[PDB]
Design a protein around this ligand. Structure first.
Ligand SMILES: [Mn+2]
Ligand SMILES: [Mn+2]
Length: 314
């Protein structure tokens, strides 16, 4: 199965800058070359060039609405195209607002997809509930069908059509949810495993339940949107919104290892790696190494080891 790497050096989803350097940081570590060592054929689409919308005035509280809207519309088109050719899309973030385009485009070809969102946050604030107006904190609000019409049409997002229903997404890692967001996930009946559930059940039982919920009645494509801040800051410090008490390095790899084993991974997002936020050079190396390890894990690398078939190593 073919893999297509798509860089999304974008940071307008936040007031903070720097995450747009994430793709370069990941590639510098050799991510693309390492992926070619897996059983997958790899193609690099390169990094998309985003056109900045001049005089991009704030829509009420929402910041850079048109720029974020345009960037995501372009990304959706690219992902839709790669998905059409039967390849697995791998989006290298900037900010999580790019999930709007990534998931929307993926949904165009695979409308029955299931989303597994690993994040310390729900990123489900709407233009009306957000306290900051940062779109990187509102991706899911633009993707859910249940929230259509729950907020005013934001400039630059007219091309968007709610891809999935609240019943097709599972959150893992939650620990920093706004009151508005909490009201939304409870009201919509969204399935989630906050750190509380991870502590109670263990990551093993968590993945079992995640698959039974999403794949119990029907097997379908999986889109894994991974925000590096889902892991504890001691593992992924170079990120914009670190929150103590996160998933461990081991737990993160367990998630990707189990997803690989389903054979259903169809789209992947590796987001929020901000190279400019490490307190030291090493903190950046640590964050990048973790993101790279997670990506390779999603594509077959197992901690127990790997070896090529039809090869007599003895
Ligand atoms: Mn996020
Ligand atoms: Mn987050």
């Amino acid at each position: 199965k073919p893999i297509e790497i798509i860089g999304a050096p974008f940071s307008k989803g936040c007031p903070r800058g720097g995450v747009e350097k994430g793709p370069a940081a990941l590639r510098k570590a050799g991510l693309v070359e390492k992926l070619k060592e897996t059983e997958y054929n790899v193609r690099d689409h390169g990094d998309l060039a985003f056109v900045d919308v001049p005089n991009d005035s704030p829509f009420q509280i929402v910041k850079n609405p048109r720029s974020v809207g345009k960037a995501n519309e372009q990304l959706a088109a690219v992902v839709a195209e790669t998905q059409k050719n039967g390849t697995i899309s791998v989006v290298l973030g900037g900010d999580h607002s790019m999930a709007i385009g990534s998931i929307s485009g993926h949904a165009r070809v695979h409308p029955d997809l299931a989303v597994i969102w690993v994040d310390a946050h729900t990123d489900i604030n709407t233009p009306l509930t957000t306290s900051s107006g940062n779109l990187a904190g509102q991706p899911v609000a633009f993707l859910l069908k249940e929230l259509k019409g729950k907020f005013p049409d934001v400039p630059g997002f007219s091309w968007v059509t709610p891809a999935i229903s609240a019943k097709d997404i599972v959150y893992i890692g939650l620990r920093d949810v706004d009151p508005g967001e909490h009201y939304i996930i409870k009201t919509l009946g969204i399935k989630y495993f906050s750190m509380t559930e991870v502590d109670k059940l263990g990551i093993g039982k968590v993945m079992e339940e995640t698959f039974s919920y999403l794949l119990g009645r029907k097997k379908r494509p999986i889109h894994l949107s991974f925000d590096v801040d889902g892991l504890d800051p001691v593992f992924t410090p170079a990120t914009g919104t670190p929150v103590v008490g996160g998933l461990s390095y081991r737990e993160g790899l367990y998630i990707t290892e189990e997803i690989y084993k389903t054979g259903l991974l169809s789209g992947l997002d590796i987001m929020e790696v901000n190279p400019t936020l490490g307190k030291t050079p090493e903190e950046v190396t640590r964050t990048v190494n973790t993101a790279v390890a997670l990506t390779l894990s999603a594509f077959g690398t197992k901690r127990e080891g790997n070896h090529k078939p039809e090869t007599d190593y003895l």
